[PDB]
Amino acid sequence: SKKQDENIVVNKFKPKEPYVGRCLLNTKITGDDAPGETWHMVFSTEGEVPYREGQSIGIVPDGIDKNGKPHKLRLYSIASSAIGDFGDSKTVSLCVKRVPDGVCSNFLCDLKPGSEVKITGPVGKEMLMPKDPNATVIMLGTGTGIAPFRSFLWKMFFEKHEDYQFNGLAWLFLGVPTSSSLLYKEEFEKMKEKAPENFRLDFAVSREQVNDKGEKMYIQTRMAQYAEELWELLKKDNTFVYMCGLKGMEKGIDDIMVSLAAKDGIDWIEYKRTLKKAEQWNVEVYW
Numbered sequence: 511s512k513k514q515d516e517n518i519v520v521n522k523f524k525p526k527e528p529y530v531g532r533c534l535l536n537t538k539i540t541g542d543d544a545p546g547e548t549w550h551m552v553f554s555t556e557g558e559v560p561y562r563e564g565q566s567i568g569i570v571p572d573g574i575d576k577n578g579k580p581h582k583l584r585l586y587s588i589a590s591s592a593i594g595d596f597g598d599s600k601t602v603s604l605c606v607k608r609v610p611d612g613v614c615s616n617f618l619c620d621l622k623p624g625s626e627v628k629i630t631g632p633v634g635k636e637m638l639m640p641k642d643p644n645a646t647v648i649m650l651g652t653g654t655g656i657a658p659f660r661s662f663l664w665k666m667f668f669e670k671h672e673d674y675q676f677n678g679l680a681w682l683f684l685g686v687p688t689s690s691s692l693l694y695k696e697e698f699e700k701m702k703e704k705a706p707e708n709f710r711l712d713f714a715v716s717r718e719q720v721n722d723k724g725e726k727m728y729i730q731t732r733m734a735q736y737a738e739e740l741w742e743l744l745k746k747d748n749t750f751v752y753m754c755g756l757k758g759m760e761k762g763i764d765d766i767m768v769s770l771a772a773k774d775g776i777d778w779i780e781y782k783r784t785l786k787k788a789e790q791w792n793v794e795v796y797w
């Protein structure tokens with residue numbers, strides 16, 4: 511395919527017999543004055559989980575349900591590239607937002623180094639990277655939605671690859687409520703200064719920023735500033751749009767795309783269906 515699916519591995523570890531990894535790192539990446547708290551953790555895999563950029567892993571949280579049975583698996587987009595945060599292909603990283611009255615999210619953030627974690631998968635087919643190293647990769651994320659895009663960009667800019675020398679256009683749109691909620695801001699800044707021509711970056715901080723019209727700077731609001739440019743980019747054959755994050759973010763984006771497409775006489779619902787079948791528009795949103 512147009513993607514990176516060359517003998518991909520999906521479901522090597524099932525919830526019955528999961529891979530029992532161990533926590534190596536677990537850092538709160540969000541500020542102390544952040545609305546909630548997102549934690550970046552690194553687990554040992556010893557090169558047992560053959561995951562790729564875009565893939566997710568399952569986490570069976572330690573505990574029992576209401577009817578005396580082990581907990582259900584919760585999916586999490588892998589925040590680290592194939593070779594991972596240590597560059598040894600023996601680790602896996604996540605980007606977990608702590609949710610109130612949540613079992614898996616709370617367990618993961620409360621994980622102490624050395625404590626074992628039940629890992630399943632890898633899971634995922636949609637969010638894989640495009641094979642073309644000259645392709646225009648447009649990543650639209652909100653909060654924890656940055657996880658596959660961090661994975662993507664690490665391969666692109668923080669890694670040496672003979673098989674993959676990226677010289678196209680990586681555009682990242684990251685939507686968060688506050689500046690203290692900005693995830694991996696530092697990594698992306700280092701990237702833009704290292705590759706100014708290849709990497710484009712845009713942050714949409716709804717509670718702090720505002721536009722010309724004075725509306726809250728959500729992802730779609732930030733996108734609207736380049737609406738003419740992006741629309742003309744979407745028209746290209748080498749353009750690959752990726753959307754990850756919270757469920758709600760899809761409505762806002764399609765809303766601004768509906769108006770653009772209207773201007774040319776195209777119905778955005780039937781147009782995004784055409785792009786989705788062409789692997790050019792990829793979505794992975796969650797509750």
Ligand SMILES: Cc1cc2nc3c(=O)[nH]c(=O)nc-3n(C[C@H](O)[C@H](O)[C@H](O)COP(=O)(O)OP(=O)(O)OC[C@H]3O[C@@H](n4cnc5c(N)ncnc54)[C@H](O)[C@@H]3O)c2cc1C
Binds near residue numbers: 576615616
């Ligand atoms: C493909 C994919 C990728 C994902 N990527 C990430 C990611 O990168 N980072 C991330 O943080 N999340 C990610 N998620 C979401 C993740 O899977 C979790 O849903 C999220 O982390 C919260 O997990 P949880 O176990 O705490 O939720 P849950 O505990 O299942 O839900 C918590 C809420 O549900 C209510 N609830 C549910 N059952 C009961 C009950 N029986 N009685 C009373 N209340 C109940 C609680 O009141 C509470 O408010 C992803 C999901 C998908 C599908």
